[PDB]
Amino acid sequence: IVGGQECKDGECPWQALLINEENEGFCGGTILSEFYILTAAHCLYQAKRFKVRVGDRNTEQEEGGEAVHEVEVVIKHNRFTKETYDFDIAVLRLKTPITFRMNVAPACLPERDWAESTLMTQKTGIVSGFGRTHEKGRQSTRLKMLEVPYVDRNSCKLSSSFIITQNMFCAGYDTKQEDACQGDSGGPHVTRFKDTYFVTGIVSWGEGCARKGKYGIYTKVTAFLKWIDRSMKT
Template identity: 30%
Template sequence: MNFLRDLSNIIGRYTSGSLRRSNSHICGGSLVKSQSGTQYYITAAHCVYGGNANSYSVKFGSHFRTTSESGSVTRSVSKITMHPNYNAQNLRNDIAVLTLSSQVTESDRIKPICWASRGYTNNEEAIVIGWGTLTEGGSSPNNLQEVSKPILSTSSCSSLVSGFDSNTMLCSGLINGGKDACQGDSGGPLFTSRGGIYELTGVVSWGYGCARPNNPGVYADTYKLGSWVDSIIN
């Protein structure tokens, strides 16, 4: 990401868990809850494509990517359910539901995020968070980062981004560039505040570089993919 703010003052308003392999951060993701109260972890399908559940764990409640922190908890992954129509070549349906080995205790630092209650509106302000690189090809921060940027219209996304699929994706960014997700942010949440409630609007998926002009980041559209997720967790 570029032009980010440190997230230590607002970490309690949602959870972005760090998806890890061999205890190293590889992707972001979000804690969600089913109607029955069971917790699940949402990430991008490409983050776990070809992997086995026992290779992954998720660290919750931590502001830091590498530093140990009091109050953080880690859960192993017991099952990976990828969207059946995920396409590794064009990244359509880039979403996966991970079942945790056991539930986590919710707190000010660990809270599930609400699912998107509706589709996005053009230029709706959204926030993306993660531990990805701070510049294209740069280094990754230890502290969780955030950046705010608008969700663009379907027509803008289709004209700006080659390979954009309006049935499964949305895009977000500034036409002049300068604000976006980057390598290591994949799977993490793009969320919007609606009536004071934070909703998971997108899942970091792909893009051409990071924060380049006329190249907004592309996200799995959680509202459009919500019926499939609902069929898995409910």
């Protein structure tokens, strides 16, 4: 995250961190239930073998409340291709269930129509992660969060060099130099409704980070709810 604020104790409990063989975070994830993690499909190419860290807020210090979980099943969307970045979604089933505690709790999955008419129509959502703090930088050791305005679908497509499909949406600022960055990928985009945080997006891609006239591109979670539901049955 470029700009934004640190996640304080218990503020981003749904954040998951994908860690490689070298124990370094490379992508984010959202906790859906004790056995399921939501991430980006493209993240699965960033590492040969990976585990899932939860309840982590600062990578330098072992909190005690942190837990590492192994992946049993990787449920990747067959329609994903690096050529378009379309269908950038994957579900991970863990070997062991997550223990919910402070900083460890799942985000709500909304219902399709309500998410579109009530969540997507709110002024903002919150993106979070351990990704780069400047376009050219190292992975953050601290979990950060950022409130990002929902961007008008027309402005979104005009801002981009690439095709913005119906499975994607824009969020961010045209001028304010704060946005998600490399390493925030697969992480949560949540929208608060009456004190309840519902998962609305998966950090997908962007043309660099925090660049003026550009935005963060997210996988539209509403477009894959049945696919998500089906995945949690396998």
